[PDB]
From a paper:
In this study, we identify a family of complement inhibitors from the hard tick Rhipicephalus pulchellus, hereafter termed CirpA (Complement inhibitor from R. pulchellus of the alternative pathway). Functional and structural characterisation reveals that members of the CirpA family directly bind to properdin, inhibiting its ability to promote complement activation, and leading to potent inhibition of the complement response in a species specific manner. Whilst many molecules act to control inappropriate activation, Properdin is the only known positive regulator of the human complement system.
Using this strategy, we were able to purify CirpA1, A3, A4, and A5 and determine their structure using X-ray crystallography to a resolution of 2.0, 2.1, 1.8, and 1.9 Å respectively. We identified three regions with high conformational variability between homologs. Another CirpA1 residue undergoing a conformational rearrangement upon properdin binding is Y122 which forms a hydrophobic pocket around properdin P377 together with CirpA1 residues F122, Y131, and F150. This pocket is incomplete in all three CirpA1 homolog structures. However, it is likely that the homologues have evolved to target properdin from other species, especially given the identification of multiple CirpA homologues in a single tick species.
Residue numbers in the entry: 29, 45 to 59, 59a, 60 to 114, 114a, 115 to 203
Write the structure that this text describes.
């Protein structure tokens, strides 16, 4: 089995397009969850992460310091260590990215008060109104994962999202 390429998360998040959460295994679902990148250096990205509660937008300014997921020296930056999130997310890592980064599968690690909470999201550049144009290879990587961990997923997005 040929080794999959590492998926650079700095290239995935380097866009002015909104990156919407299209699928998630998160239990406490944030409706209309999305990211808007604002600035990026070689060591960190700066982005606005938002979601809606009762149709009202809640925003946070987050910082992600690039790193390699396996802590390999000089490895590909497929991971960000996150500061500024009041929900406790401290790391995300890009498990798959489509060509031109139109879609990505992102694992999330958070800390509540007791232990690390882990889930996974399928993220799409621009509004995923036409699901038939979202890369099926991206969907299948997410499907393969939810089959392995035996979990169901929901979609935080609908047209109503601001």
């Amino acid at each position: 089995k040929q080794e999959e390429p590492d998926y650079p998360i700095n290239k995935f998040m380097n866009t002015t397009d909104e990156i919407w959460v299209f699928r998630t295994t998160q239990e406490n679902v944030q409706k209309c969850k999305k990211d808007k990148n604002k600035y990026m250096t070689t060591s960190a990205t700066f982005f606005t992460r938002s979601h809606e509660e009762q149709d009202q937008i809640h925003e946070q300014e987050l910082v992600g310091k690039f790193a390699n997921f396996y802590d390999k020296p000089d490895g590909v930056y497929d991971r960000i260590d996150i500061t500024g999130d009041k929900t406790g997310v401290y790391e995300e890592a890009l498990a798959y990215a489509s060509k031109e980064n139109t879609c990505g599968v992102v694992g999330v690690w958070a800390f509540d008060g007791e232990t690390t909470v882990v889930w996974r999201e399928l993220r799409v550049r621009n509004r995923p109104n036409d699901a038939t144009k979202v890369d099926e290879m991206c969907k299948k990587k997410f499907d393969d994962y939810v089959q392995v961990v035996n979990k169901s997923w929901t979609s935080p997005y609908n047209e109503k999202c601001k």
